[PDB]
Amino acid sequence: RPFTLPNLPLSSLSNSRAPLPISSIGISPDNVQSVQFQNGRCTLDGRLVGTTPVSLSHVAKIRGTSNGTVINLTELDGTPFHPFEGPAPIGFPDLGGCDWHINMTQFGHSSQTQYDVDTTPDTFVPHLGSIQANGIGSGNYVGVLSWISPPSHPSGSQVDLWKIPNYGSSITEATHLAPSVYPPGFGEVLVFFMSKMPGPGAYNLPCLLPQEYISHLASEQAPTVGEAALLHYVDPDTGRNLGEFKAYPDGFLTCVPNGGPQQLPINGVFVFVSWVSRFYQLKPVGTA
Amino acid sequence: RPFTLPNLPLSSLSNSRAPLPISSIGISPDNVQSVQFQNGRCTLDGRLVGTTPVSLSHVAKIRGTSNGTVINLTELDGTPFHPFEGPAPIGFPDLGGCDWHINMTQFGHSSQTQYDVDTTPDTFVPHLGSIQANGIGSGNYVGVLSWISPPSHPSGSQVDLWKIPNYGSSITEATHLAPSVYPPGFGEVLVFFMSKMPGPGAYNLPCLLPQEYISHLASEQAPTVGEAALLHYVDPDTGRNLGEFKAYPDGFLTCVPNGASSGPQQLPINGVFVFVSWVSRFYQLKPV
Numbered sequence: 012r013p014f015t016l017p018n019l020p021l022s023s024l025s026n027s028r029a030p031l032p033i034s035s036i037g038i039s040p041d042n043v044q045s046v047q048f049q050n051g052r053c054t055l056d057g058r059l060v061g062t063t064p065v066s067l068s069h070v071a072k073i074r075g076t077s078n079g080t081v082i083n084l085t086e087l088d089g090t091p092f093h094p095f096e097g098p099a100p101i102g103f104p105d106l107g108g109c110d111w112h113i114n115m116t117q118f119g120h121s122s123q124t125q126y127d128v129d130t131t132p133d134t135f136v137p138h139l140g141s142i143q144a145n146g147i148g149s150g151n152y153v154g155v156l157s158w159i160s161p162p163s164h165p166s167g168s169q170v171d172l173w174k175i176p177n178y179g180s181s182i183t184e185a186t187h188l189a190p191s192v193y194p195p196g197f198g199e200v201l202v203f204f205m206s207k208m209p210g211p212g213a214y215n216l217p218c219l220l221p222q223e224y225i226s227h228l229a230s231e232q233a234p235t236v237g238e239a240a241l242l243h244y245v246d247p248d249t250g251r252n253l254g255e256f257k258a259y260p261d262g263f264l265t266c267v268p269n270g271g272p273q274q275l276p277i278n279g280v281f282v283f284v285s286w287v288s289r290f291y292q293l294k295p296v297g298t299a
Numbered sequence: 300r301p302f303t304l305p306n307l308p309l310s311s312l313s314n315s316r317a318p319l320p321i322s323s324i325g326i327s328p329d330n331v332q333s334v335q336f337q338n339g340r341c342t343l344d345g346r347l348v349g350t351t352p353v354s355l356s357h358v359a360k361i362r363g364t365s366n367g368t369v370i371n372l373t374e375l376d377g378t379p380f381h382p383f384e385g386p387a388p389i390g391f392p393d394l395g396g397c398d399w400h401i402n403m404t405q406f407g408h409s410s411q412t413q414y415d416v417d418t419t420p421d422t423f424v425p426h427l428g429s430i431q432a433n434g435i436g437s438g439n440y441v442g443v444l445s446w447i448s449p450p451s452h453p454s455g456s457q458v459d460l461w462k463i464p465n466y467g468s469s470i471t472e473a474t475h476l477a478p479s480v481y482p483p484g485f486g487e488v489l490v491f492f493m494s495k496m497p498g499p500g501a502y503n504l505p506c507l508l509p510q511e512y513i514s515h516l517a518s519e520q521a522p523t524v525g526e527a528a529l530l531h532y533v534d535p536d537t538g539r540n541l542g543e544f545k546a547y548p549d550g551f552l553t554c555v556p557n558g559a560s561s562g563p564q565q566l567p568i569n570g571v572f573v574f575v576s577w578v579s580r581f582y583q584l585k586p587v
């Protein structure tokens with residue numbers, strides 16, 4: 012059975028770093044070359060890496076018990092979390108460069124509570140299982156990311172969703188992060204799937220793969236994966252090819268702009284064409 | 300290419316009526332025969348019906364503009380909704396038998412607001428695009444279901460998530476509901492995938508298919524669908540067959556329980572449903 016990607020239009024799919032619809036395709040700003048996202052990471056043969064879960068019902072969520080001073084984290088199903096397992100429990104938010112506002116609810120209790128998370132202080136150590144409670148009263152909670160705002164520290168800094176948070180006790184501590192993703196060359200640019208994120212600005216959250224691609228690849232467990240997969244981005248009504256793309260084994264897409272992808276409509280489908288060599292040269296998007 | 304279901308354990312998947320992890324398999328109470336859920340509805344050949352979306356990022360969400368008295372609904376991306384399209388916009392919550400508490404956020408503004416929804420009054424008419432604001436101030440909002448509680452009317456009623464809400468101006472108005480789903484006979488009962496829902500009780504939300512099955516079937520667009528699919532529920536560790544099930548073309552699963560203390564609700568949730576073969580609608584299952 013040949014390799015496949017989901018036969019679904021991009022605009023019907025979700026971001027893999029928060030539970031938000033995809034609204035556009037984009038590229039990184041020119042002061043960003045590599046990224047190191049911890050959610051939305053899955054290889055073409057179905058290996059989840061970082062904190063990535065199979066399902067969106069786990070994405071950008073936390074679970075833990077507050078004692079009024081700290082929240083001691085668990086996995087989302089209540090299973091214990093230990094530092095050797097990763098930088099944070101599976102599905103923990105990976106949005107650097109902002110304050111988080113997490114909606115906290117409880118099994119067996121009424122009400123919801125907004126939990127305000129600054130990810131910069133020394134008390135923010137999810138790799139060791141603990142984050143500051145910041146006024147959340149004692150109890151067990153499940154929280155989902157709801158909206159974001161500029162970081163509290165350093166003052167005057169802006170929202171920057173190309174970053175990841177400081178999961179460890181310091182910037183030097185080893186937290187078992189998923190490795191960085193780098194542009195591969197050949198004039199190719201990394202492709203990101205973008206979602207609008209609520210909050211006091213025009214926030215756009217990038218990810219490397221839609222969440223439904225992750226569950227697809229994890230199910231498919233491709234027995235054979237070549238050096239790179241040649242894709243066409245196809246308009247499903249006319250069947251027209253809107254542009255050539257490559258997908259790489261580590262789980263990201265590229266194209267050659269002109270341009271691009273920022274201008275492409277979001278109602279297309281990515282279709283596997285064939286395995287090509289890593290250095291296969293793409294026609295610039297739109298061309299011809 | 301033969302028919303497939305996702306090769307993923309149930310415990311890694313999501314409910315299709317709210318963005319919640321699957322925690323158990325269940326059957327309905329004795330006084331529930333048919334169900335008429337509007338979300339989590341997809342045929343085996345990939346036809347979405349009711350208000351079902353492809354992606355969990357649309358499930359149990361609302362979008363609209365409040366004027367202080369009513370909320371005028373749209374689709375989640377802002378596109379207009381009209382009564383001919385269905386009982387409510389795509390993804391609108393379909394949990395009857397409870398009050399809803401929806402977390403409302405805004406693009407371009409700070410803060411979240413809890414929106415309390417009684418689905419019984421004459422002002423709750425999402426089929427006509429309008430629901431009461433109940434104190435939500437003027438503005439455009441996106442909301443997601445956060446937790447539930449017992450219905451405000453009739454006073455003292457129980458939480459009954461086997462029901463759907465009154466989408467129309469009365470119980471008699473035709474709102475283009477997806478049709479009911481019935482137990483097919485031959486000793487078989489409907490099988491449901493259950494999630495724990497936050498709120499002041501031990502609430503268990505049933506659905507007919509996990510959301511990741513819906514996106515899989517919608518992508519697969521199976522060209523051949525038989526009278527019924529014979530399935531095995533398989534332990535992925537040992538490969539052992541834990542029980543026989545049937546999947547029917549309209550998009551639901553069944554089994555024959557081996558008594559009351561013994562049935563699908565006692566199965567572990569770490570198994571995978573695997574397609575075996577197409578069988579006749581009358582194929583007699585071995586009890587679980």
Ligand SMILES: C[C@@H]1O[C@@H](O[C@H]2[C@H](O[C@H]3[C@H](O)[C@@H](O)[C@@H](O)O[C@@H]3CO)O[C@H](CO)[C@H](O)[C@@H]2O)[C@@H](O)[C@H](O)[C@@H]1O
Pocket residue numbers: 110112127160161162163409410
């Ligand atoms: C509205 C609050 O948002 C979060 O606090 C953020 C903080 O908000 C401040 C507003 O910007 C300011 O207009 C005034 O209202 O004070 C607010 C509280 O300090 O702004 C900083 C950046 O300077 C961060 O973005 C904060 O996260 C939230 O934590 C609060 O609970 C409020 O909901």
Ligand SMILES: C[C@@H]1O[C@@H](O[C@H]2[C@H](O[C@H]3[C@H](O)[C@@H](O)[C@@H](O)O[C@@H]3CO)O[C@H](CO)[C@H](O)[C@@H]2O)[C@@H](O)[C@H](O)[C@@H]1O
Pocket residue numbers: 121122398400415448449450451455
């Ligand atoms: C906590 C509130 O929950 C929702 O209101 C529900 C209402 O809650 C009442 C509590 O049960 C009662 O102990 C006391 O606190 O008054 C509450 C408010 O009336 O109960 C009815 C059922 O009788 C419904 O379940 C309501 O949804 C919510 O709407 C409120 O804003 C509060 O969060």
Ligand code: NA
Pocket residue numbers: 130131132133134135136137177178179180181
């Ligand atoms: Na830290």
Ligand code: NA
Pocket residue numbers: 418419420421422423424425465466467468469
């Ligand atoms: Na109504």
